[PDB]
């Protein structure tokens, strides 16, 4: 009865999909043609008619209750959220108002022109049944071309709201038409529309939050969470359909959108499996519905054919096209005023890319089935089939031409240059590999013509004067922007930036490059991280200032008793005497708790007052009915267990914003530093490079000062986000070391898998990080200095010899050219350093001035306080005493010298830059493995070996072995020198640093 | 009616699975307990009884027609094939005979002891229902421990055949019992059993091959593959269930096993999606069936309970355990004789790990439902539930103890050492990263205690004298085998070896290491690739020697007409007069074709005779019925279109064998060369290293000679496999270059994705490589020399000046110490080279003796022919003329010198070895980028710069700039030398080679 048709449907869909990949027309028109042929054969032959009758005419209920929710939910699940949320107001107003006006204009035009004695409800149904769209083909083509991502996002997101409102309007009007027994009270209809618009999405959001909370507590288990997600989606649909006839789809769409938004609490394999599952279901439904409508329209077309009926279809197509055009034409200025740059090219490509999908066909089938033996069903089916087959051919084939006429399909010159370079590199590499392979001792017999013919890559895209000064500065600006963009890409690929910060940086760089003479500006980034200054923060502050056997199990049991005692309230809204006895027991329990609280000084102000009032009401227990109804006010006492959840969620929101705001600034600073380092030797004119360096320095200084002030504003979030970043970096480098060990063959693959699983579990806990408000104490900062960890005696001696100082805003601590009084450690506040040309801003965690206590040199900086600062001061004499006291192999002077050597040697290695692809992190790690070598053991003579990779001289004077050149510190000695000779000078001790190989 | 129970089932399964991860007992016993509690509540409360009735007692048809096939097919799909196929006979005989004897012994024991007036059929049904197993828990635990992989494979594969035979026996005996109206003819039963045993698996294999053929022609499409596979599986099940009542499961198991075997024709994403889908379905069915039996057992156990009834369960458990033990006890010698080393520890752990799963519960539910109002159903259900809950607790908890008593759970010392080293490296790396991070300018505020306390990783495992000479040689052998194992792992990770070759090599290395004084031997590898010498090859040879408008469209249309004319032949087994006219037209067409063949000299011997006989039969058209039945023998003419398919499939099989046979030998040779190179400096005793080097050289020589002879045997397969290897290597290096370009940030990620997609399509075409019989011509080999490509004039001149020589076996071509007559090129055959100490074997594709034509030195080799050889010879004076003629920048002498320099400089770079993780391929690629520099332009003075990486002097004499040392070629000059001074000597021209940096 059903098996033959479904198997044939799967086979024909597979055949058409595989065979029509090259052709521009979609496979759906082919499926429609096959449905028509099957309809003709069923009309003639009785056997295939018998085999087709059972599925050709199904119930309307199964169609509009299974096929439509699957399609809508898949279309919601496939789409992302952030790109949709960036333009929510625009797409919302466009979809709603365009649908309303298109429906009403189509209805009145059908009434005026079709010459059918139709009520207004039928015309509204017809206008709503040709308002659904399906831009899947055109959005896929636009993604393939990659013209404008935001335009594709908007055209994809419009159709979802379009389909939702179309299904709502069609449902209510079909209920009005085909079941006239319902009462037409205006207030009842208003309440129904209100509950459709409100209760649906709220129910969907509630179940989405509940299922996300349950998903948040599952580790390394796949099956459980897949089953939970599927059961939750079906339960939402079932409840939303039993409660309201049509709101189920409007609830399940919100469910899918929200659960898709939370992509950081669902394992990637489950995500890809669910995506594949829902896409496969949508495919199956789509092919089935096209072939079904094909056979039914062929079987019921000969009895509804007329010359005027055939003529009306063209007029209908013209009408729908012109109204779709004029909607955007009328809405262009309003959508331009809101803050979105609508343009005529985007307008015309959007208004021309209006297709018709399976939703209109589904509603047509429903109407035709419900009409029974009448003419309106056949006319609806014929007109909608005609218009869909007209548009799906004509518009889908001419959309490519209309794209190619305009500039969307064009390819920029830089993309062509990059592709040409890449193809040249691939061809050179393949030629080199072939040349190496032809000289092997085993593969010297392969058919080389066949070998080199099969593997080949083809280019897919290919088929003093003021004017001179302006040209040079324009070229320099373009080169700087290009270097900044590739630095952002390299940083993202290394993993130091999230995707969102990368997208913001790339978009800002492209916008600045589009302008004639505008560099990248910090004001845009300033408003990018300025989202902290928002009214949710003020709400959090006000609710925090408004708000505030001793075991916690006591209060937990009280809450559990309250939850269990909720149920008799629902029972109210012998059998009742046992409940009354339980009530009296609860009253006695509350009395005992309040007696204990009276023993606990009863200092509660408002909660105690409300508890006393509720106890007074409970002691009392038509006026009887009101008393029994209103005695359940004690639920107000539960609100003291509800504030911490709100403060936790608002802290989570502010942390989620602050992480992005911090990441974008850090990425911009690192990229600017790298570009400023690399631009040194490329450019020729001195004035141009000087001006560019000044601009970059001004921007960097502004960004670092603003970010430091933002961190100073409130530490509870900054500490948490910094800790999360540190743990993520440590785990990433551990995973990299694990992969390196596995690749070197020193570890079996199963053990590598076990360690990777452990690292993945740690990363999952990091993602489920704790509450983001840990406050740090100053003693931990004092004991957490890089050259102080692991030495209890040193820590105790420093704590004994330390001092605490506090300064207000505007004070000056030390000045350059003065004697070095001691060492500093910024433990609270922000500080500005300026001395002779460079200017910097430091914050908590950074020490200041080791030169005075190592080299005994005068201060080379000037210190000012931008706010109230707390600092720890250590005298120089105590540091000298500690140096002369501890003489272990990890000596204090050893660690201080290592730290300053690393700090002063990083810029030189970065300045070399003969290598490419090395960032700050890689250079710091490579420099970290080294250890400085004392010259006392080597008798001030050093022999350079092949084992060591790179050497640096920090402080001292260098003498060659034979040429005897006097070299001043600090510099990187060349590989030319072989033996280093040194002399003992009391004024300055030489300092050398080496880096060994791997082993 | 059903919604509440299914949703509760999903919820309870999720809860128990998530909560009982730590506990040793399986989660299913919790589901059984929950089912019992729900049964009690349903017995008391009427509402839950109403909500449970609709699922507690289902129609048994849906149970044994849906739940069982899903479980069996998932268990078949999850298991692999190759490990199953390695021990097919053993598991087959064990499963079949053990099931038979267990069933009959359990039946007779029930008859003797249970004191129930039962027929023998009920006892046999009991024996069949107590024989089903489910080792999922124990095999998962054994994989986690990783004691013996083959034991896990055998214990997993036994249960599949056990379940299949159990369901078959249960089906036939239930049909005998509960439907006694069927006829009991012995011949009918024999024919039925034969058709069950034969027609099922053949039908499954046929549809498996058809669907594999259809899936073989789909590119970059995922949805079509999934839908086609699912539809094919369901169609196989439906046909196998319509035709036979029970053989559907036996067909679908073969379907799943075969489609899982072909893992090289299905995209990985489709594979993982299908695995996840079927695993999820099996999970859902499993939890639902446990809770259903839990809710039904309690309500029916109240009326069937006795002291002796409770007593019998323990006796039954003892009986099943002892019979399962004695089966293996009796089969130990027979299974030892076949060629498998059965041991008592594996025997006891296998016979103790016998569990009971959902299959027995399903069959018990079916019997209880079909019994209706009787006692036998309740007794079967109670006994099955009791035995399964007994074993799933007792055996599943004591299996870990019985494993820990024996040596399976022990951990070897090398694994502990490797884990200790890896954890030490991870800890050092984490400490280094933390030390670097604490000095950053942004992350100086993170709570360091929380940071360093979370990202921590701990090792999971921990909680002259002859005796001296023997110890040293044992240590040397262990170290050599170790280094060989790491060499194999590194080669596999680089990608040069397939998984099976790696598994064979690792297994052979472990077997050799287990023996006291046995090295790795080549005889095992000899029989590993000796599978070519098999009777399929002789069958192919005999069928090839037995067998042999002119457009091919003519024969194609003839075949199509034959295919369409098959249908009236089936119709045989006005309406008939038009068919008769059709056959007359076909006879006329055949007459025209044969007339044309007569015009084509009619030289066909056998096919022409059979065609003439069939034409004689056709011209003729109760004897009438026989003639009409036997006139359709013309189908014999189609067999000439079937032979090429057989030769293609047998060629594919022999190619699939030869690829592995070639890979294992190549991997062994490379690993032996690397270990011999690395063993030079590790060991101390000279005699030991000399003996090991001699052993390694003997093995390498034997392997290379045997592999060369195997290649010489037939070239049609060797050429194809070599070409496939070359194209795969080229594509892999192209993909690596693409990833490097993407990581360097010079290419946008979308373009990188496009290029990766193109490379993936090329790789898919490589996998769907053409027929593996391309024969090579000699002129292509002559023109495909490395220093001859790209020069048409040079190729033509060489072809004009070339000569061809042929030699027989045993002849000697040239001898050492003689004048260099010319240059050699082996274009056919195999050749042995021996001269003074090293001995080698060369084959087609390798040139011989460039030293005589470059350095004008006497021959240093002796050449013998191991078989008939064809050689191209080029005279020395012609090469001198070509050298003195061509003077372009890519000169001939330039290319020859580059080739010899690379060949002679690879071993020095390998011997240098200050580096790890570099193979022959990486060293060759690094050496390839270099170019030799002429000293005429530099006036015989070279200045070493920092840009160049490595330099190597091939021929000449080296002098330092100042120290003036005389250095003899060939050697790698150290980094110490700065400027190279050279002099002009007519007797020897200096030759230098450099390698530059990346840019």
Curated annotation (Swiss-Prot), chains A, B:
Key word NAD present in the record?
no
Chief localisation class = membrane
Tell me the impact of changing residue 628 to Q: Alters the half-maximal activation voltage of gating current. Shifts the activation of the transporter to more negative voltages
From the UniProt record, which GO molecular function terms apply?
Answer: cAMP binding; cGMP binding; potassium:proton antiporter activity; protein homodimerization activity; sodium:proton antiporter activity
Which residues are noted in the entry as 3',5'-cyclic GMP-binding?
Answer: 849-851, 859-860
Q: Which domain of life does the UniProt lineage start with?
A: Eukaryota
Q: How does activity depend on pH?
A: Optimum pH is 6.5.
For region S4 segment of voltage sensor domain, the annotated ranges are 622-682
Q: What Gene Ontology terms for biological process does this UniProt record contain?
A: potassium ion transmembrane transport; regulation of intracellular pH; single fertilization; sodium ion import across plasma membrane
Residues annotated as region Interacts with the transport core domain?
499-514
Other remarks? The VSD and CNBD domains are not functional in mammalian SLC9 orthologs. In addition, the conserved Asn-Asp/Asp-Asp motif that coordinates sodium ions in NHEs is lacking in mammalian SLC9C1 and SLC9C2, suggesting alternative transport mechanisms and/or substrates.
What's the protein called, per UniProt? Sperm-specific sodium:proton exchanger
Q: Which organism is it from?
A: Strongylocentrotus purpuratus
Report the gene name: SLC9C1
Q: Which residues of the full protein are shown?
A: 76 to 1193 of 1325
């Amino acid at each position: 009865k059903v098996i033959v048709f479904i198997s044939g449907s799967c086979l024909f869909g597979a055949i058409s999909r595989s065979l029509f990949k090259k052709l521009p027309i979609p496979y759906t028109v082919v499926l429609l043609i096959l449905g028509a042929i099957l309809g003709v054969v069923a009309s003639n032959v009785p056997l295939v008619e018998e085999h087709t009758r059972d599925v050709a005419h199904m119930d309307p209920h199964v169609l509009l209750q299974i096929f439509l929710p699957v399609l809508i939910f898949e279309s919601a699940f496939a789409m992302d959220v952030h790109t949709f949320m960036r333009s929510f107001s625009q797409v919302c107003i466009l979809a709603l108002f365009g649908l309303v006006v298109a429906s009403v204009l189509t209805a009145v035009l059908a009434m005026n022109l079709f010459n059918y004695n139709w009520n207004f409800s039928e015309a509204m149904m017809f206008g709503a049944i040709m308002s659904a769209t399906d831009p899947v083909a055109v959005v896929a083509l636009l993604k393939d071309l990659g013209a404008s991502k935001q335009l594709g996002t908007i055209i994809e997101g419009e159709s979802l709201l379009n389909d939702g409102c179309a299904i709502v309007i069609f449902n209510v009007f079909m209920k009005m038409v085909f079941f006239p027994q319902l009462t037409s009270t205006v207030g009842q209809n208003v309440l129904y529309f209100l509950q459709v618009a409100v209760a649906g999405p709220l129910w969907g959001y509630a179940v989405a939050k509940v299922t996300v909370f349950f998903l948040s507590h599952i580790f390394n288990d796949a099956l459980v969470e897949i089953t939970i997600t599927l059961a939750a989606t079906y339960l939402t649909y079932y409840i939303g359909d039993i409660w309201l006839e049509v709101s189920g789809v409007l609830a399940v769409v919100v469910l899918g959108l929200i659960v898709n938004a939370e992509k950081t609490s669902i394992s990637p394999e489950v995500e890809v499996f669910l995506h594949r599952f829902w896409e496969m279901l949508a495919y199956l439904a789509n092919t089935l519905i096209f072939m079904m409508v094909g056979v039914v329209v062929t079987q019921k077309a000969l009895v509804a054919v007329d010359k005027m009926d055939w003529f009306y279809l063209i007029i209908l197509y013209l009408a729908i096209t012109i109204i779709r055009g004029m909607v955007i034409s009328l809405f262009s200025p309003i959508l331009s005023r809101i803050g979105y740059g609508l343009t005529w090219r985007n307008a015309v490509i959007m208004t021309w890319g209006g297709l018709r999908g399976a939703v209109g066909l589904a509603l047509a089938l429903v109407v035709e089935n419900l009409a029974g033996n009448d003419v309106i069903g056949s006319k609806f089916l014929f007109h909608t089939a005609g218009i869909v087959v007209l548009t799906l051919v004509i518009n889908a084939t001419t959309i490519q031409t209309l794209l190619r006429i305009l500039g969307m399909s064009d390819i920029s010159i830089p993309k062509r240059l990059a592709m040409a370079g890449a193809v040249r590199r691939i061809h050179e590499g393949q030629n080199r590999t072939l040349n190496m392979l032809k000289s092997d001792r085993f593969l010297a017999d392969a058919d080389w013509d066949i070998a080199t013919a099969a593997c080949e890559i083809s280019d897919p895209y290919s088929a003093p004067s003021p004017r001179e000064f302006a040209d040079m500065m324009e070229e320099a600006r373009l080169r700087m922007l290009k270097a900044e963009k590739i630095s952002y890409w390299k940083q993202f690929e290394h993993g130091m930036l999230a995707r969102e910060a990368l997208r913001l940086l790339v978009q800002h760089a492209e916008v600045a490059a589009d302008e004639k003479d505008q560099f990248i500006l910090v004001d845009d980034l300033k408003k990018s991280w300025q989202i902290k200054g928002i009214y949710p923060w003020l709400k959090r502050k006000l609710e925090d200032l408004i708000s505030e056997c001793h075991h916690m199990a006591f209060e937990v049991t009280i809450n559990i008793a309250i939850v269990l005692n909720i149920v008799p309230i629902i029972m109210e809204f012998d059998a009742l005497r046992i409940s009354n006895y339980v009530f009296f027991v609860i009253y006695a329990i509350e009395a005992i708790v309040k007696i204990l609280g009276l023993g606990r000084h009863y200092i509660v102000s408002h909660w105690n007052k409300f508890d006393a009032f509720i106890l007074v009401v409970a002691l009392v227990d038509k006026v009887v009915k009101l008393f029994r109804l209103l005695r359940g006010l004690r639920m107000l006492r539960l609100t003291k267990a509800l504030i911490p959840k709100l403060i936790l969620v608002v802290n989570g929101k502010i942390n989620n914003q602050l992480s992005l705001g911090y990441d974008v600034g850090k990425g911009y600073i690192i990229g600017e530093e790298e570009v400023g380092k690399i631009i040194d030797r490329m450019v020729d004119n001195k004035k141009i490079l000087r001006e560019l360096k000044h601009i970059s320095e001004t921007g960097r200084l502004q960004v670092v000062k603003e970010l430091g002030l933002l961190q100073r504003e409130h530490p509870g979030i900054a500490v948490s986000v910094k800790t999360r970043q540190a743990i993520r970096t440590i785990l990433n480098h551990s995973r990299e070391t694990i992969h390196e060990l596995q690749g070197a063959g020193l570890l079996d693959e199963m053990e590598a898998h076990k360690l990777e699983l452990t690292v993945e579990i740690k990363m999952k806990r990091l993602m489920n990080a704790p509450s983001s408000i840990p406050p740090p104490p100053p003693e931990n900062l004092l004991k957490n200095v890089s050259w102080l960890a692991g030495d209890m005696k040193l820590i105790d001696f420093i704590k004994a010899r330390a001092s605490l100082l506090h300064f207000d805003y505007g004070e000056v601590i030390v000045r350059e050219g003065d004697e070095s009084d001691g060492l500093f450690l910024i433990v609270s506040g922000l500080v500005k350093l300026y001395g002779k040309v460079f200017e910097d801003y430091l914050t908590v965690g950074n020490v200041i001035g080791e030169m005075g206590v190592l080299t005994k040199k005068p201060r080379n900086a000037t210190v000012t306080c931008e706010t109230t600062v707390q600092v720890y001061f250590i005298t120089a004499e105590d540091m000298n005493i500690a140096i002369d006291t501890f003489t272990l192999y990890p000596s204090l002077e050893y660690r201080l010298w290592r730290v300053v050597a690393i700090r002063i040697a990083t810029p030189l290695i970065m300045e070399q830059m003969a290598f490419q692809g090395w960032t700050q992190e890689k250079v710091k790690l490579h420099l970290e493995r080294g250890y400085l070598v004392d010259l006392a053991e080597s008798h001030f003579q050093f022999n350079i070996d092949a084992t060591l990779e790179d050497v640096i001289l920090i402080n001292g004077t260098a003498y060659n072995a034979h040429t005897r050149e006097e070299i001043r510190s600090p510099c990187l000695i060349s590989r030319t020198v072989h033996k280093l000779t040194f002399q003992y000078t009391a004024t300055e001790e030489p300092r050398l640093f080496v880096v060994r190989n791997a082993e």
